[PDB]
Amino acid sequence: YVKTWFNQPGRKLRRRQARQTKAAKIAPRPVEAIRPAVKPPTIRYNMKVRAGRGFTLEELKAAGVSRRVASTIGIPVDHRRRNR
Amino acid sequence: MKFSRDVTSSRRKQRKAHFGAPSSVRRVLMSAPLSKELREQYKIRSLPVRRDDQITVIRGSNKGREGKITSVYRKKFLLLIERVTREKANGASAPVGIDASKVVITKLHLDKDRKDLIVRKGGKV
Amino acid sequence: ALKTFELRKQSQENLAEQLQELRQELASLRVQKIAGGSGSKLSKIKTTRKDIARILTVINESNRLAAREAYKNKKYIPLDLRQKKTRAIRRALTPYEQSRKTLKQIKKERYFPLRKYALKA
Amino acid sequence: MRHNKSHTICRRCGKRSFHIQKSTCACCGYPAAKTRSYNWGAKAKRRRTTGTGRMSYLKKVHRSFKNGFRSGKPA
Amino acid sequence: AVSEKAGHQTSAESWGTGRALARIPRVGGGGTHRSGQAAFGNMCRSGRMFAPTKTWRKWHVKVNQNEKRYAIASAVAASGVPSLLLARGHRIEEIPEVPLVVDDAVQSFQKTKEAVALLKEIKAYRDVIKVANSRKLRAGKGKLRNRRHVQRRGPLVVFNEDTGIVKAFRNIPGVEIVNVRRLNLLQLAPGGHLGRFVIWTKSAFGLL
Amino acid sequence: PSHKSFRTKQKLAKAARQNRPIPQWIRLRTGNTVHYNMKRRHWRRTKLN
RNA sequence: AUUUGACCUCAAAUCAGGUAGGACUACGCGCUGAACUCAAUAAGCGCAGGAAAAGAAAAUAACCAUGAUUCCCUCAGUAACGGUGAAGCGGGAAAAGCUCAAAUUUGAAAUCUGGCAACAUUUCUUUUGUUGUCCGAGUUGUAAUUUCAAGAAGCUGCUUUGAGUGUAGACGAUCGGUCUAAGUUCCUUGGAACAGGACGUCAGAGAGGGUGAGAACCCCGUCUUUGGUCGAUUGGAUAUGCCAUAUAAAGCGCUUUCGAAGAGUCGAGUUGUUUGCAGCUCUAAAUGGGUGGUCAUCUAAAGCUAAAUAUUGGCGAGAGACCGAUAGCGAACAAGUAGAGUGAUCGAAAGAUGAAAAGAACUUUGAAAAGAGAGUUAAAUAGUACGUGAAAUUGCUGAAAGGGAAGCAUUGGAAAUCAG
RNA sequence: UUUCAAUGGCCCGUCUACACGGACCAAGGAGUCUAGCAUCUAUGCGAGUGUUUGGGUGAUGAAAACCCAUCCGCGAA
RNA sequence: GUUUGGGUAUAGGGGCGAAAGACUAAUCGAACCAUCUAGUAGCUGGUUC
RNA sequence: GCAGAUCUUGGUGGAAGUAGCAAAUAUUCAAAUGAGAACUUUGAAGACUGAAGUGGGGAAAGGUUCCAUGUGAACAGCAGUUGGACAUGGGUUAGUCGAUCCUAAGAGAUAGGGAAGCUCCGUAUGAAAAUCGAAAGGG
RNA sequence: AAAACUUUCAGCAACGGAUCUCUUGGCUCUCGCAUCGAUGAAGAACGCAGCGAAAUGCGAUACGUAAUGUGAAUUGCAGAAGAAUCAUCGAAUCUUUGAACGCACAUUGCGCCUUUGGGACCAAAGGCAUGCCUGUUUGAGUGUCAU
Ligand SMILES: [Zn+2]
């Protein structure tokens, strides 16, 4: 059993068209949602900052936007993450 | 050079399509040009070949012969012209076939359908 | 041959009689072929066969439109009059019952629907 | 001395493979509801698979699908 | 690659030893022309070839980016030298200057007549005729395999902004048009031979 | 034998029609490679099975 | 006595209306499973789709903590086990969340299938519904609210609101209809110009194919085209009209409040399979239980869900530093065909006349087949047993040699031939 | 070129003299592709080095080419 | 000087056999068919200017 | 990139006009057809199978070989004017003959019970009630 | 010591089908799409044309009809003459079978129900499989009850 990569340019082109189709469909709004700033959970990468899945309820409430309307305006919500 | 992807450039596919085209497609393939007076009269460069059209041979051993068409023998991409025949061994007349693109149409067979074709193909009556 | 449209503007019995005389003629034409006939008769065999086929076609159409009129606006109709796309499409969920939602989801989509927003660069 | 028959013409598959005493076709397995097929017989599958016949309905479905399964009469 | 099942989908086992004949497997059965014939061998007719070609042969090859940029820079420098162009084969005997630079007024051309008029007026049209006259019928199975015709290479027009230059020049036989920011090695030094005749625009030359 | 079933007789009937010579006019058509019969059987030769 | 009516259970009907089978299987999910780690492979069995499966933690971690699933690079050939062989983190592709059971609407079963009658609507007289009425289901629980991220009940004063129905333009897309620039000008060769030379043209079109030889300009196409013109559909929004009924519902901050959470299931012992799963003995708990080294993190034993992902099958296409008729699929062809076997099955060979049959009139010899004259053609050194037509082998002619071998080498004569 | 005269000349391959293959001819026919490791050579950069897992551009064919980015691989103990 | 036609049953380290280690579709070193399989090679024979 | 692999496929040789041709005693004369007669047809003569046939019929099996007309490309280890070969046609008529009906040995649906399952047992069986099987049997 | 024979060389003619050229085929890669069936599928059988055996198409409306588009053919002959072996395809027909469904099928075997027609019999049309679900009707039960 071998897995060959002769469709790598084809996959790349298809993904770009899918992004293009997504942009055309939902053009009024950005094609990528807002993501929170989050620090990796290990001693090797705790010095960096990357994009987390979504914001928390405490952050949402402190900002003043409710968790119900946050999804509607495009703010992803993570119910698992907590601010320590 | 072609820039689309809906059309082909393979010799294999072009010949297969050409020799396997149905009668409706062979009608378009079996087109002939018009004479200078006809071209300046209808503003049409080329027209499909139809029976009972008055044509003149431009190339081949019958270069200069003129006559009407007795049949457009489509399944061999061939025309048959009055008096443009061959003497067989016994002496009978066997019609000599001429390709549709090697002749010139010097007089048309006008009906309502063909006039519609002329006005539709950017022409004037 | 008979034109299909003027075949349509006639009644059932006339098409029935035309069918009957066509079958007489076809039987006569075939016995000419067996006993030796001219090329006109041999070619006429095909065109008369097609003309009976036309009369069978128009008769069947008139019957089916008549049946559709009879069963118009009814819950249950014969399986021939029913649609036949595929067995899977027939068994699938209809758009109405795919769009059915609980009142909980109706309230959610009433009060917090997908909003229309944008970002200033 | 060879004037008896072990197999006869099968009703379902039309081959002379229907055994008489066992009353089961060696080719297609009739009277079993399921057609006899075995993955070690790749060539045996492709001799009797779909496409070796008329495929009359499947061609009908394919032309129908290519147009979205529309019904009725045009203008 | 050949079919991975090619040469295997028959039925043939070796007849054994002492048969007064070779021990290659032979197709069973009888009454047919194929029965008794050998199979499963590169020597055998209708048999699998030795080491059947596979699709995961190494078709593509990795080149260091710096090496690629080194080659492209050398190719441009080679194109800027008259003697290398003559060895390349470009008929540039009466070309006024190498490297050849033309104003930005040609980036907005619209007609092949205009492009051909420019080529004659700069006297680069000898190269175009050389390409046109060199069109021949390919020798070998190439024309069977969608490579019907072969010709030479003409001037390489390097532009900066496409406002009509690409379409106005693309139909002249041998003329190849490329943006300055995407200079391809295969077009700058085709065939591995340095020093193609290149016609620059002002904006492309300034952006070099 | 003289006690065949209908299905046997019908299979025999078309097997007798299959091994007939080809009309000449179909050969005389153009683009028609058919010039002989390669499904010609004989009773003394290969059995219908 | 016994007759009458209920409920429960179980039947029967060619009762009314529906549904399952079988086929394909490349990819997907399970059961089962060898032999020469082989291999959770092949075979066998069951079941789907356009993807399937998995999926919103009884998850990792020991960090400043990460946060559904899937896929890719990396971790890494590392940990681990005895050659097998991960995963966390990190970078990307894609992103979307949710639904039930467990609590009384008790001032009101507010719920739902079916029958009947209208009203409609349609990819559609073929589709999908609405209302009214009847019967039935249902209190052994159908609706609304709640799913732990919470939530309910009070309290509060701010904010929000349709599961609708026509008209018009624009914006896309599917299907097919239809539109396209310029030599066939001159001379030579030729059967044929599509070759060579001269004089010209078009090109957003010099890709490809056909035509009597190498055709941009003879024809089809090609560029224009991410378009003009036809029609029929629609998908979503904009403008505009009409119905709706809010005496309501929902979000947010507080609690003087309570916070229900899945059982022969977890778990333990034992046997079996590659921690995970199964058989069997036994069998739980409610700040309890699971997982990781008192702490940290999750909340199982109920369920749904696009996307990135796979795709030797099917349907369309576009290609190729592939093969060029003993090759390439077994099959360029009347190929799974002819044919072989009781059967499961096995399974070939075989492409090319010519531009056009113009497929050899007619005469002669011959029983005929044919031959010889002719005739068609540029060609019969193209006559179907047909492109070109090699070798082995054979016949004829010419030259030469030859007493149980023949072949070969060196030198030269003889004959033939070529050359400076 | 054929041939004659003189001289010489055992039938080739395989296998350890023998033996095994060889009637003749045409076509096909046998150290290939790939993963890792090692030596050497060449090219680029150099305490650095590696674009092609990915993203952007590429219209004239767009599976090419060009550009961009954090991990990460090896090395720097 | 019991044999036999047809129907039916018994199927693979099985069946069948007055037992020969015999028969089981011209095959019984172990029926036939197709896959695993291109199975295993210390061995033999070839391996091209 | 081939001289071999008891190589593969195809073609062709020397042996070689050589080995050899089938059992089943046996043919001869005349005439006709015909280009052509040891082999076709008629007559005459001589023989053979000798009712356990070289006879007349059927079952299994074959499938148009049946009959007429025509041909002599290919097949009939010679030949052929003949054929069972080739080409064109024609030909099988049932209330009473068979199948069809019944059942034997046997196979097996169903109600139930197993199996992870394709499916096995069960068919008179703990049910709210078969069928197939004989062109030699019965008719 | 000439012929014949054998062998070698060359020309020609045979045998054979190599080589060269071609190629509506194959192979490989990539892209797009999701569409079988009790409303009868895949498959099998038997038929259908003026002259057809195979291939293809189709089903007693049979090398097909309806509808839409094209616009003057098909072709080997004959033949007549909105044509055509044209394309598209939403309307129909679709024989015997096959999951195959009245019972069987090595059988053109054997039935039953409803209606109609013909001059008891025959013919024609429509029906009769299995399991399961929802409902309807009738029941069965010394099962539990109320009068
Ligand atoms: Zn069968």
Author numbering:
A (entry chain L): 21 to 104
B (entry chain Y): 1 to 125
C (entry chain h): 2 to 122
D (entry chain j): 10 to 84
E (entry chain C): 53 to 260
F (entry chain 8): 2 to 50
The article reads:
To determine the assembly state(s) of the nascent ribosomes associated with Fkbp39 in vivo, we determined the cryo-EM structures of the particles pulled down with Fkbp39. We identified 4 major states of nascent 60S, and each state could be further classified into multiple substates. The nascent 60S associated with Fkbp39 represents early ribosome biogenesis stages. State 4, the most mature state we detected, has 31 ribosomal proteins, the ITS2 is processed, and its associated factors are released. States 1 and 2 both resemble S. cerevisiae state C,33 except that ITS2 is cleaved in state 2, state 3 resembles state E, and state 4 is similar to state E with ITS2 processed. We did not observe clear density for Fkbp39 in the cryo-EM maps, suggesting that it binds nonspecifically to nascent 60S and, therefore, is conformationally disordered. Notably, we did not find any nascent 40S particles in the cryo-EM data, which is consistent with the mass spectrometry data and chromatin localization of Fkbp39 on the 25S rDNA.
Eukaryotic ribosome biogenesis is a complex, tightly regulated process that involves many ribosome biogenesis factors and spans different cellular compartments. Here, we answer these questions and reveal how the nascent 60S moves from chromatin to the late-assembly compartment in the nucleolus of Schizosaccharomyces pombe (S. pombe). In vitro, Fkbp39 binds DNA and nucleosomes but dissociates to bind nascent 60S particles and to partition them from chromatin through LLPS. This partitioning provides directionality for the nascent 60S to move into the nucleophosmin-rich GC, where its biogenesis continues.
